């Protein structure tokens, strides 16, 4: 059920990343990501969701010049839950070097993206659609690696101590 989901997510990130520059209609000489300020109802598309199951899903919000993407990551148990939360927080702090990350997640999600017309301008939008998918994949992996890395040391550290008594 993984590839089916990532296929349905990809195609929606395809339709959604069709942006263009757009000067503010509300404010003089201003320019803002419409999906964020929502000050002009007609410029906002229909929010849509693509869910894999009752837990993992994605929210794609589009506007004439910006797309906001919110991923709900898989957290099988407590250990993954905190590892995930510590990993997303970690990247969000670096959102400035990540240029397409939202400093905070949309309430209800684990991570969020803010892709503006400027990004799709200086980055092959198809390659960006690949990133979001590449991303969703890699986080589930890295979380699994961290998980095993914790246990891998919990064992050595528990044997190292008991072997000495």
């Amino acid at each position: 059920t993984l590839r089916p989901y990532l296929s349905a997510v990809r195609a929606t990130l395809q339709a959604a990343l069709c942006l263009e520059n757009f000067s503010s209609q509300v404010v003089e000489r201003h320019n803002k990501p419409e999906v964020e300020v929502r000050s002009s109802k007609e410029l906002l598309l229909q929010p849509v969701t693509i869910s894999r199951n009752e837990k993992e899903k994605v929210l794609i919000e589009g506007s004439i010049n910006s797309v906001r993407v919110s991923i709900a990551v898989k957290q099988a148990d407590e250990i993954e839950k905190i590892l995930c939360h510590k990993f997303m927080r970690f990247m969000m702090m670096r959102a400035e070097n990540f240029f397409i990350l939202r400093r905070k997640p949309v309430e209800g999600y684990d991570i969020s993206f803010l892709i503006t017309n400027f990004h799709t301008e200086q980055m092959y939008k198809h390659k960006l659609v690949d990133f979001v998918i590449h991303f969703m994949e890699e986080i589930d992996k890295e979380i699994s690696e961290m998980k095993l890395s914790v246990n891998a040391r919990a064992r050595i550290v528990a044997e190292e101590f008991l072997k000495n008594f």
């Binding site: 510590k86 702090m93 890395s149 891998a152 040391r153």
Partner: protein, 388 residues
């Protein structure tokens, strides 16, 4: 609290660490970590300080490059042992005072905080600017305004400080530091003394630099004293790693620190005499702050320790500055300028000393960003650290 804060000055060649209130550091170790070169617990397999310098089965790394942290995975582990192996402090029980190099970015301060609050759970943190601490350390000889000539092993800085804050736009780097004075004395020796174990060339050199070198007022008159009353030539003896080799120590004694004033001697691309560099920096600062900056030229660093270093520097800076005032009067009556170079006992570790003194006061706990604030506002709070 009943427990003192932790104070850490991570220099590029030496890290001064200890508890606050103490006049001296509890440890001063080479800023290096040795590693294997990860599954299980390989990350925990490392050593630091001298222990890490020559581990047969390990590679020596130096995280702190040019004063700025180049490797954050390494700089974090170094902290792991600094805390659990040397200070033996439970980081969750002590506030920590870390130093930072001038021009260190805000992002970096956030990385440092991330490490301290996320990995070790410290209750409070304060990232102090080295130059300022160096100034407060001088109160030992008050104000936070003055010129701070800092020199260690990597390179030297001339940092103008106005009321607790550095004048970023007016700093200047000088391509001469401890490391250079050693390489120079090393050549001097290679061309005159025989019997010095190639693989112990630098070893010997550094020994002479700290043990015998000093700064003289005039070269010819110095060169003369030696050639005359050759009660100036000292002998040094070490062990060939196992027979003994003996050498005479001469000219290098005053020729080493000399390169600071006459850079062109060792360095081909730099020539400005430190005395001038200070002059230039103060000149580039606000007309209204210069005199003050001139009255409080403070030294800080293992490479300022040399005998008379402050006397020669001050003398040279007066000649430069006075001569300048002469041309004006001539050209046309400017009140003379008081150039004073302050030197105290706490100089070798001036920065850590200040951090140690300052972290014992109560106002320290008031300016520290607390863990709670870290959690409720985010790592940004560590971008600015109230000077006091």
């Amino acid at each position: 609290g009943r427990l003192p804060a932790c104070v850490v000055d991570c220099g590029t060649g030496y890290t001064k660490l200890g508890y606050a209130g103490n006049t001296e550091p509890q440890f001063i170790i080479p800023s290096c970590i040795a590693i294997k070169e990860m599954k299980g617990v390989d990350d925990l397999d490392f050593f630091i300080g001298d222990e890490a310098i020559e581990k047969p089965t390990y590679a020596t790394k130096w995280p702190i490059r040019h004063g700025i942290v180049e490797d954050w995975d390494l700089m974090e582990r170094f902290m792991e042992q600094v805390i659990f192996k040397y200070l033996r402090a439970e980081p969750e029980d002590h506030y920590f005072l870390l130093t930072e190099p001038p021009l260190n970015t805000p992002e970096n301060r956030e990385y440092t905080a991330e490490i301290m609050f996320e990995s070790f759970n410290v209750p409070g943190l304060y990232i102090a600017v080295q130059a300022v601490l160096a100034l407060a350390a001088s109160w030992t000889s008050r104000t936070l305004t003055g010129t701070v000539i800092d020199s260690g092993d990597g390179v030297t800085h001339v940092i103008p400080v106005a009321e607790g804050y550095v004048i970023g736009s007016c700093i200047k780097h000088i391509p001469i530091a401890g490391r250079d004075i050693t390489y120079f004395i090393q050549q001097l020796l290679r061309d005159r003394e025989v019997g010095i174990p190639p693989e112990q060339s630098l070893e010997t050199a550094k020994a002479v630099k700290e043990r015998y070198s000093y700064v003289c007022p005039d070269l010819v008159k110095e060169f003369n004293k030696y050639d005359t009353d050759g009660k100036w030539i000292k002998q040094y003896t070490g062990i060939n790693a196992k027979k003994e080799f003996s050498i005479d120590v001469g000219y290098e004694r005053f020729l080493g620190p000399e390169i600071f004033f006459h850079p062109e001697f060792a360095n081909p691309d730099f020539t400005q005499p430190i005395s001038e560099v200070v002059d230039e920096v103060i000149q580039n600062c606000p007309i209204d702050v210069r005199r003050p900056l001139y009255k409080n030229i403070v030294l800080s660093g293992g490479s300022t320790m040399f005998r008379d270093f402050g006397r020669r520097l001050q003398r040279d800076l007066k000649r430069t500055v006075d001569a300048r005032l002469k041309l004006s009067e001539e050209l046309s009556k400017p009140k003379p300028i008081d150039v004073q170079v302050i030197t105290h006992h706490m100089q070798r570790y001036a920065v850590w000393f200040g951090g140690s003194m300052l972290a014992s006061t109560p106002e320290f706990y008031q300016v520290c960003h607390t863990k709670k604030d870290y959690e409720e506002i985010g790592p940004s709070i560590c971008r600015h650290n109230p000077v006091f």
